[PDB]
Amino acid sequence: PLGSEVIQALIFKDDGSLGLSISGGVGSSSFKSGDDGIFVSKIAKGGPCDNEGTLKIGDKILSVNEISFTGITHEKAVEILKNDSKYMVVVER
Amino acid sequence: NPNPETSV
């Protein structure tokens, strides 16, 4: 209805995890049609990402702590998200 | 192409 929305969310880790599972990436099978990118493919109920409440499944991750996630691999995104306790994630919905 | 879903 509003088109692509740039949403922002600050999530704090718990038990070395952010509570979200990602899919996609450059060199990977696309999560959506002809769109490489890191997508929130799952949200663990009761986890940090769920308890914050801003992110939703299907969002393309655009940035994580000002690290551009556009044009990166799936393995690079996993390597980044598994570093710090605070995560400022910017997504497009 | 690989289609991975990684828990983070």
Q: What is the 3-state secondary structure (H, E, C) of chain A?
A: CCCCCEEEEEEECECCECCEEEECCCCCCCCECCECCEEEEEECCCCHHHHHCCCCCCCEEEEECCEECCCCCHHHHHHHHCCCCEEEEEEEC
Q: List the structure tokens of A47.
A: 């986890």
Could you tell me which CATH number the domain at A6-92 has? 2.30.42.10
Q: Cβ contacts (< 8 Å) between B4 and chain A: which residues?
A: 23, 28, 74
**CA distance linking residue A37 with residue B5, whole number of Å:** 13
Residue A10: Cβ-neighbour burial (10 angstroms; 0-12, 13-18, 19+): exposed
Experimental technique behind these coordinates: X-ray
Structure resolution, Å: 2.8
Q: Which residues of A, range 3-32, sit inside 8 Å of B by Cβ?
A: 17-18, 20-23, 27-29
Most distant CA pair in chain A, distance: 37
Per-residue b or e along A53-65, where b marks 16 or more CB atoms closer than 10 Å to that residue's CB: eebeeebbbbebe
**CA distance linking residue A75 with residue A60, whole number of Å:** 16
